Amino acid sequence: APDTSVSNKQNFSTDVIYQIFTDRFSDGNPANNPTGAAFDGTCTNLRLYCGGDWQGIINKINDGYLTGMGVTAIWISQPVENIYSIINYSGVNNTAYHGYWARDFKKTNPAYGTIADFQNLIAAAHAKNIKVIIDFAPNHTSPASSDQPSFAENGRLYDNGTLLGGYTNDTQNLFHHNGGTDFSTTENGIYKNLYDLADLNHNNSTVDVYLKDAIKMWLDLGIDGIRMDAVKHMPFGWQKSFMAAVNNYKPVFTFGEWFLGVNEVSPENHKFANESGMSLLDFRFAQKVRQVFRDNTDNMYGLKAMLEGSAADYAQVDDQVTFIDNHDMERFHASNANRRKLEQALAFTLTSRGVPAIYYGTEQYMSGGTDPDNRARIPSFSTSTTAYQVIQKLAPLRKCNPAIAYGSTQERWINNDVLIYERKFGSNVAVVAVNRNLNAPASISGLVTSLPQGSYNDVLGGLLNGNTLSVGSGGAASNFTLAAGGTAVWQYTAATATPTIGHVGPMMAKPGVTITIDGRGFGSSKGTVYFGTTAVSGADITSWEDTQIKVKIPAVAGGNYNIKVANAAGTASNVYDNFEVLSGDQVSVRFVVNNATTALGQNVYLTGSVSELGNADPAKAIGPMYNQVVYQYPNWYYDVSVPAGKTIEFKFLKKQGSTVTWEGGSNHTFTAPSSGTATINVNWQP
Ligand SMILES: [Ca+2]
Ligand SMILES: [Ca+2]
């Protein structure tokens, strides 16, 4: 099918996701309502159980509210069974209405619905061209206390009914026991508890296997995507082996939550997004958009710079999940005023790079503070709101215009309160002019674009005070007046001649796995897929359309490659870099090194005989390794996803500045496991 089909689990750029907090959306079946002190019919107490369930969600689907909006995907609350306990925090009673306090990843939450209810959810949505993304929190279980078993549910972890263990008396070692986290360091915040949430020990074979088994169950259910929780509070090494597990099996678009504060740029966030095998939330995009349209703590210059920087930092920026607000921030809309700001941001976000998300109720101009004041129940389902329209107008541009789903981003006109950017993909253009100044009308002159010559009517139909554009020869738009707080969208579409790739996914898998190349001008006739230098043609190319191709990863050596297509004729497309062919199925193995003394700025990295280990390249070495929590310096440690059932030769190195000091002697060798975790404790060879 076309890259624009509901069937495409690997691509989400052309969609518009709608983030729904299940319990605060629609109550379609009163039956599953929690009782007693855990329920609040009125939803007046934003910390109890309101009644939101899968049923209600289906009800909004077939009723037109969702589809009307032009929404194409829904990311819901964690489907899994949560704890029933009614925890009390310094007086206030709380619940797992949020869906993060899990007890059993193999069962559903009765409140949300039953397996059937869920399956009904997947079928109801699929029937309408709506994708389904589920939240999955493999980080912790629930709140617990080592010294107090009776509190809550002792972070107990079940396995489809059969009790695995609990925080207290963790003899199996399913959990971590290094106290809570202070967020001081990336390492510290991984191996230590988050508040009171009993951290899971993925280093345990029992926990690693089980979790990789829970997601599959959901996989086989119908989900078209996952939303990893606390991707920052989980061992990067282990996450990659998780992704490897999903990919090598039933690949699906996966993104995670790596919070970012105002003006916050983490080189670590980039590396995770780039190499993990999954995208992340675009806090970088979101944080700035707010400073530019809501709190106004930066100008369009701050906006442009972000757009540019981000574009080079993330290897697959067209994979980041953009938004203006969510569960972890207050509502973009200030009760106080000017809704035009929200709408401008809304306009901004849906016509920009990446996959746009929309927090439920945003189209209703919802207020509130930080959680729980940002999870109130949707106050109405009216389709007359200007924000619903705006979404209803620009949303489908991701499906109809490719420059918007795969285009690039270039500034073309800008000052303090104005920004005129253009998306460009093949012979597809689109220019979005935005005037944030709410008190003045901007006068633009000298604006140049890629649009052909002719008139261009504002897609928004003057909805945001946007005008019709007059583009003369050369692409030199006439002198027009951008209305105050105005917003306009002119675009140009056209058949694309040469093969152009706009997407690839999964971006990480072993040989045999089937990838989904997306773009335009591939031709209706089967061609050939090049994986670096190796070609792919014939029966190994499961499918070929003008928009999307489906080939099987060739039997090549694990490592980074380039994807490039050549239509039946022989014409070579554009190159798509950063594809990782794994040496095979993966496992999470923790590496240990003794007496690795060092000096300031000098750290320890790990390299090895596998692509997964950097193939001996020091530029591609693993680390810097950790050395404070689990193990203490001079002992260094690190969790690395390695090829399963393979004899590996490794050697440690130390780096300080650009200078590398190698380990002495011959490589240490060991044999990774064909399943589960494993630890390798060795000593530094002088
Ligand atoms: Ca209900
Ligand atoms: Ca953790």
Curated annotation (Swiss-Prot):
The active site is at D229 (nucleophile), E257 (proton donor). Binds 3 Ca(2+) ions per subunit. Residues 499-580 form the IPT/TIG domain. Residues 139-202 are annotated as: B. The record marks D328 as: Transition state stabilizer. Ca(2+) 2 binds at N139, I190, D199, H233. Ca(2+) 3 binds at A315, D577. One of its GO terms (molecular function) is metal ion binding. Residues 407-495 are annotated as: C. Substrate binds at residues 100-101, 140, 145-147, 193-196, 227, 232-233, 327, 371, 375. It is found in: Secreted. Changing D328N: Reduces activity 56000-fold. Reduces activity 520000-fold. Pfam families: Alpha-amylase, Alpha-amylase_C, CBM_20, TIG. Residues 1-138 are annotated as: A1. Gene3D superfamilies: Glycosidases, Golgi alpha-mannosidase II, Immunoglobulins. Residues 496-582 are annotated as: D. Ca(2+) 1 binds at D27, N29, N32, N33, G51, D53. Belongs to the glycosyl hydrolase 13 family. May consist of two protein domains: the one in the N-terminal side cleaves the alpha-1,4-glucosidic bond in starch, and the other in the C-terminal side catalyzes other activities, including the reconstitution of an alpha-1,4-glucosidic linkage for cyclizing the maltooligosaccharide produced. This is Cyclomaltodextrin glucanotransferase.
